[PDB]
Write a protein that binds this ligand. Structure first.
Ligand SMILES: [Cu+2]
Ligand SMILES: [Cu+2]
Lengths: 620, 620
């Protein structure tokens, strides 16, 4: 029914059938990406034609293809051959990651490197990482993965505690060749284990934690209809899921009186990159785009009740395609629940004698993914007062290396001889805005200090200024915490009762952006990460800040290319791209398993309503 | 038993008796401040002498006094006459705020101003505010309060909705004279009411919220002994309460194996200033130090179970003295409870096949105070991983004015003709550090970008740098969000197993600091608010960043004076003073009652432990 419904197992199977029938999915083909296409702007087609987009990989080396199909009409709408050496390789297949360790196990150079370190190949695990784009001419036209070694002493051992430094190998996953084996020298392999479930390391488990029971006797306050349409405390939205981006929120709107007022048309984390800052040749190439290269939704965890999600939880089990086009369900991959959120508003008035207190609550929509040693949680929150917030939670096991005898300026020591290279976790939130409709504009708001003098004799006055970003070329902005800089998305054609354009204010955490030298490969490939805010004019094919094909793709696509069009964004259908991230200098406390660290952003109403929208909240 | 125990009603009664019998509490005397004194450095002297510090005001204009008494021996240890014209006026008495409206009610100038506006004097409430600035000549030596008018139509009416602009009066509360009435012109009094409990404004109340039950079948995981000593998940501390500062945390320590390791000796919000940025003569002097001038602890609210504090709550009911020395209990003034705090650590490992998830929780200690129209919540959090955090919650009703015809650059419009002047809420957290002992030092840590070239050919490297603050003259620091600046408090004499000084890292929110012109009276009186972080050498008499007698003092007192001593702070008993605040440009959504907005800071372990201190947390 709803054109925003989740993809069904049936639709996935249908796509597979359509491709097979078209002669586009024979035995040598693989689905590297498959997702449902969002409806185009405006009620074009009389009805809603369900379409899917697919990236088809060829294991024999033939050029891949991008194909769009109509599952409703059973037809291929478009199919284009891709020149990967130019526009980029398709995302990595889960089945290719396994290829690396296997191939290296039979390579003389690799075996010789392990023998030199007295390491048994059968106990050496190899972490397969994306290759990026550097100075290796032979990699032109090759589908490459780079491997870093870790020793696993036994089946349940945490290999991350035993990094094999000074060694790295490059592999052509298609031709099944080891292009290079680099050995910069033998480094002692850290000896201590990092088995956080081992009693000798955890010591006796504490028995002081009493239980906390969180329940909802009458059930949750939100309703779920059409499989993924949420209605909660005036909020309305559709919870989508894409194998690349993960959870995606659609049609976020708020009920104000007799009308449903749109706020954000589509909200997603369109990219997430983890750049490493260790200049060692062994890892200086290390940068993985979880979203763009790996597809985070694909690795979403099945969330356990009471453990991952506590309270009255309503689950969604999104379906994705496997490498052959078969539907695969991610059971309980999405948690949805509401939670108490402290005091919302409070005032004890002496004159009126009235004491008033109201509590707040928020709707939570989340999923958690695992990328090798890292695990990331994605959380979207909706508050009673109209605030929208996103929060990323980073945990898992830190990527390790050896710790240099002479110390290091780019690595921290976690244990004897065990290092943790410095790195960042930078996200890009793509917010297709729709403040009271699609006619929107962005204003940069700065606090303004005033000089003592005429009109300000006491020197106490302070103000603010707003600058409307009118063209894309002027919409690449930097944060400025010192001046309390924020960005307001308003609708110049929709005013509140005080005759002011309605709006929402974006509050950033103002964390450092990409630190890499501007001339670096990563600065170019992750250009979006160098600035805090970008505003573009909406366009169907501008989906990710890094373009459609990130794997082994040079700069040239993404935000810098979109912005160049210098389109009008003053009172138009626009998209805000907010960069935010964490800069991680690992601490001893992050070992053997790290406690969650967080980062995000939020948007609060700014003259969107005619007064507080929570005056109708009961005392309960 | 414990020298850090809360003051008892009996102790207050004893102080009253001691003062009375000593002839220091005559009919004209008033207790402007009364608090127990913390133990001095060195608890070697068995059995501590319970001493109280008292500020005695004299309503006849006679010299006030600072008296120290011993309730243990029942004697007056010291009594010093105060020269208010030199060292500042004593905190405002609750009974003085009341005299302002009463005195104005009989002043011909005031009555004429109201008559011209057709306002019934019996319906005009007067918000009594501190002098706000120091300048006027005739005010020197004179104990002044200023008054701003608001119309209350009926007993339960919210007067804040009806400000009477263009009018302000100054009152000498001791001589009981109206020194001046300034009328700059008539402004319409905003017509709409702001009664948030009126169905007319709230509309039909929501019936969509289902209950959320939060319980603890086996009780809380924390224990409370000695009335205020808390032990929870390895944490140990004493919860104190002072009429000026409110909740104060003492001896914060963490159990690491067989050792109780100290982290912070005393933590408190030593000051909180609210400067207004409207250049109008009616309010350009407006600045109130809630802590220093009003005493926030005095106005702490009684917190209702299931409303202000939800869950399994353990209350503390601190006792304070009234203006006459009588004990007054603040029933349920302090809430204490633990709450679930999502996922603590998580990792699903492919190689080991082990899936691990642990949840986090925080211990919460809080109180809420009401200062006229504003209501502020103070929250201290202790996390399982060793993190300590403070969070202030600002709510209540915004201070209003008229919204001038033609607009304003320093006031926002909340309703027809109703304005809300721009202002800030800036706090100062005084942290008497004790990282593994009193020998501490502070290092400013900045992220360091590196240029591509030799040793960094790919231009991916990035580092960090730490600068030790060795003398107070170089310990006045500013934030730098761009470089991810933080401050680490370490103990150079206590190292972790990796031979590195143990420490804790302070993460600020990097919000704007005091915006007023550098030459303003407020910039001098609240100099602490102009810089993000100050470090001083510990001293018994250096309690507040604004000095002991903030009211009507000329400026420079507190931090600027302490810092001028230029003492050694490199490996010494030091105190960190962190300035943090909110810059408020009121929104329509903040009217008629504002939803909570927050600010805070946190400190996380930085090489304090030898590995993660939460490996012993059970799965459950
Ligand atoms: Cu990290
Ligand atoms: Cu405010």
């Amino acid at each position: 029914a709803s054109p925003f419904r989740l993809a069904s197992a049936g639709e996935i199977s249908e796509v597979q059938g359509i491709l097979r029938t078209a002669g586009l999915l024979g035995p040598e083909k693989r689905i590297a990406y498959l997702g449902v296409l969002d409806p185009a702007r405006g009620a074009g087609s009389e009805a809603e034609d369900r379409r899917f987009r697919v990236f088809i990989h060829d294991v024999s080396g033939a050029r891949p293809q991008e194909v769009t199909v109509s599952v409703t009409n059973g037809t291929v709408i478009s199919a284009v051959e891709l020149d990967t050496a130019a526009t980029g390789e398709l995302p990595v297949l889960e089945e290719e990651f396994e290829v690396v360790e296997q191939l290296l196990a039979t390579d003389e150079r690799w075996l010789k490197a392990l023998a030199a370190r007295n390491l048994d190949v059968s106990k050496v695990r190899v972490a397969p990482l994306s290759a990026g784009v550097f100075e290796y001419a032979e990699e032109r036209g090759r589908r490459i993965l780079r491997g870093l070694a870790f020793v696993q002493d036994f089946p349940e051992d945490s290999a991350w505690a035993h990094p094999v430094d000074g060694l790295v190998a490059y592999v052509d996953v298609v031709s099944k060749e080891v292009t290079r084996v680099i050995d910069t020298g033998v480094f002692p392999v850290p000896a201590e284990h990092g088995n956080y479930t081992d009693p000798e390391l955890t010591g006796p488990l504490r028995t002081t934690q009493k239980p906390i029971s969180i329940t909802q006797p009458e059930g949750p306050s939100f309703t779920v209809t059409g499989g993924n349409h949420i209605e909660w405390e005036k909020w309305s939205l559709d919870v989508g899921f894409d194998v690349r981006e993960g959870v995606v929120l659609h049609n976020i709107a708020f009920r104000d009186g007799d009308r449903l007022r749109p706020i954000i048309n589509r909200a997603s984390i369109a990219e997430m990159v983890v750049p490493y800052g260790d200049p060692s040749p062994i890892r200086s190439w290390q940068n993985y785009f979880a979203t763009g290269e790996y597809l985070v939704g694909q690795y979403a965890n099945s969330l356990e009740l009471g453990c991952d999600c506590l309270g009255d939880i309503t689950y969604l089990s999104p379906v994705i395609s496997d490498a052959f086009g078969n539907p695969r369900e991610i059971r309980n991959g999405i948690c949805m629940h509401e939670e108490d959120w402290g005091i919302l508003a409070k005032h004890s008035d002496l004159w009126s004698g009235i004491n008033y207190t109201r509590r707040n609550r928020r709707m939570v929509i989340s999923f958690f993914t695992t990328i090798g040693n890292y695990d990331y949680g994605f959380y979207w929150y909706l508050y009673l007062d109209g605030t929208i917030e996103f929060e990323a939670k980073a945990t898992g096991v830190v990527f390790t290396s050896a710790f240099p005898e002479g110390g290091s300026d780019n690595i921290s020591q976690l244990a004897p001889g065990l290092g943790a290279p410095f790195h960042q976790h930078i996200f890009s939130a793509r917010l297709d805005m729709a403040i009271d409709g699609f006619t929107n504009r962005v204003e940069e708001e700065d606090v303004v200090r005033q000089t003592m003098g005429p009109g300000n004799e006491r020197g106490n006055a302070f103000s603010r200024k707003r600058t409307v970003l009118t063209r894309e070329s002027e919409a690449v902005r930097e944060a400025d915490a010192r001046t309390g800089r924020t960005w307001i998305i308003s609708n110049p054609e929709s005013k509140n009762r005080l005759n002011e354009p309605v709006g929402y204010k974006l509050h950033a955490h103002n964390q450092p952006t990409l630190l890499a030298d501007p001339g670096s490969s990563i600065a170019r490939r992750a250009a979006f990460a160098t600035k805090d805010l970008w505003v573009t004019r909406y366009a169907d094919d501008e989906r990710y800040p890094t373009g459609d094909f990130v794997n082994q793709h040079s700069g040239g696509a993404g935000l810098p290319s979109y912005i160049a069009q210098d389109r009008d964004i003053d009172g138009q259908d626009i998209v805000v791209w907010h960069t935010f991230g964490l800069t991680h200098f690992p601490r001893v406390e992050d070992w053997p398993i790290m406690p969650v660290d967080t980062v995000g952003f939020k948007l609060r109403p700014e003259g969107f309503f005619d007064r507080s929208p929570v005056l109708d909240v009961p005392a309960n």
